[PDB]
Amino acid sequence: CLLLCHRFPLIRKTTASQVYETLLTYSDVVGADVLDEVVTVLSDTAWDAELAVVREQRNRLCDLLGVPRPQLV
């Protein structure tokens, strides 16, 4: 999740694609009633766009996967 919002948009896109591939590979990570919303959110999100627009979406995924929101000064 920390790499999902990197300074380079290509790194963000690569991390998003790799996370999507790993979620499609392993099925014992996220539950059945949670993985659907995660896949729907990860697919309908342009990670190569305004960081303010993208960030809001990443905080969402964290809250959907039980992860504390990392913040900076």
Place this chain on the structure above:
Amino acid sequence: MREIVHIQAGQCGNQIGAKFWEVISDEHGIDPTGTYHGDSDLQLDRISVYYNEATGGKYVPRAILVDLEPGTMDSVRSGPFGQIFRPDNFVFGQSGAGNNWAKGHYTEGAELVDSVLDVVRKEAESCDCLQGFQLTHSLGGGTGSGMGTLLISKIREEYPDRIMNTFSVVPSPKVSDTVVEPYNATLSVHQLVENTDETYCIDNEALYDICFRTLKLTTPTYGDLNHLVSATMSGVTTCLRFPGQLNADLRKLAVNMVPFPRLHFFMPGFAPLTSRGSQQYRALTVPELTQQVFDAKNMMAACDPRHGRYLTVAAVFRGRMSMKEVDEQMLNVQNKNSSYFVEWIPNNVKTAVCDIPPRGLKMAVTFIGNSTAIQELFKRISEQFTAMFRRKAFLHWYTGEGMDEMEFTEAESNMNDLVSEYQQYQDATAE
């Protein structure tokens, strides 16, 4: 006037040269009769490079046709643009070679080399300022493999202050089922490593895989590959026939692109890849064409440059575009802060813009690079070379003519040394 003499060897070489001349004649504006009919002044400012001036404003093509078999000679002469060629440059034999390097280099190949030199010597005497030569052939048969290297060494000696560039064709088992082919190919490489300034490797396996996947062809014939070969050759020789901001010739290009004399194998490319059909999809933009010409899918060789290190890169654009847009693109893409940043595209790229677009395409980009990925092809060839030298199969065919067994071991050692040098030079940084 920096004139360049062109030589054609073998059936493949003759066909490729004929198609290249056919392509460049329609671009320069020359009718089958021999006169000029273009509507631009930029089509004649460099016509003295590949043509000669005659009486009545004629432009004779500067190419020589040589073979040990006449079938190809008759096929071309009677072609659409065969009447413009000089009949004195037709030197052919009868028997041939039969896929044997010895029969084409020491036996029947040496009984015609002197006759070939006659035409060359005589053609180079009328040139006011000769720059170099050129040769198009293939590394599969016996004629273009043995007689080709022989003529190359002849030019190297008689003329050691000139330039030598070849457009070899790498054979593939998916097309030809010949068995000794690999040996002949090695014997040619053993001489091309030492007596060549620049080489453009055109892998037939890569073209077959492209025609059998991207273009989707049930049975890709020879013309389907020859079209792409001629298109790539017309895309590369644009700086030598049309001026621009990147003022260079053959000597400057060989100095800038070839830093080491032993490392000079390039990998060409062209985008977009179209078949022989007279159709078109949509006018692609500059970034799309750049991404297509820089991708490993549009590579003429079966080698991935992503696994290697780029040495010298040079791209040539053709279309109604401006240099400012190309500069802005090359400056924006190489920025990691942008969203359209890519890693599979190098940074040191020499850009060039041409006004005249290719025949049938409004915008097209040509890729020329010196990636260290030819070691994969050299290992694929060495695999076949070692999988047949252990059993000594078909080795008596060469020794029964006058060849020595030490030549094969010397060629294998040279190939191994070249592969090791490429592997050593692949890892290089500068901080």
Place this chain on the structure above:
Amino acid sequence: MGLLTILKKMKQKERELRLLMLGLDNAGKTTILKKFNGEDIDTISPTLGFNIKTLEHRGFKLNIWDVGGQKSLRSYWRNYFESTDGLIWVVDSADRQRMQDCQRELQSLLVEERLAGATLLIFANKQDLPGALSSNAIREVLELDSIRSHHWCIQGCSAVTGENLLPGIDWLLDDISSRIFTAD
């Protein structure tokens, strides 16, 4: 074109050939030469060294290359100006000790190739004497079933009722003329 084309044209016009004759029995070669020339002693007996003679038979310019030794014969097999078209080897029937060397020389000389090659003619002189081998024994000893690209033929001869030798010599000429030259 060149010197090779002119040489081939001259060979096809004058019908010139080159028959490399080998052997060491120094007894079976006389009749062979007598078949090439009406003479009986002059240019009929084999020489110890190496002699080149030219005779005319059936309108064919035969260039017999009589070699006495039977070692390192690859020097006479090939030539920068002319190749070998026929090969005639004369051995002894009642001699099983000097046959292995001849078999090894024939195996090292004749090799496999793409198209056809020279024609072989194995001669077996002195068959009426006790101890002579038949055609099957000679074929099994020399191992002629593994020799391809060269048509071979065993022709027997004897001092008495030797079944002559006309077909053995006629087949060689019929196979040579129908290979390089054209019938019509």
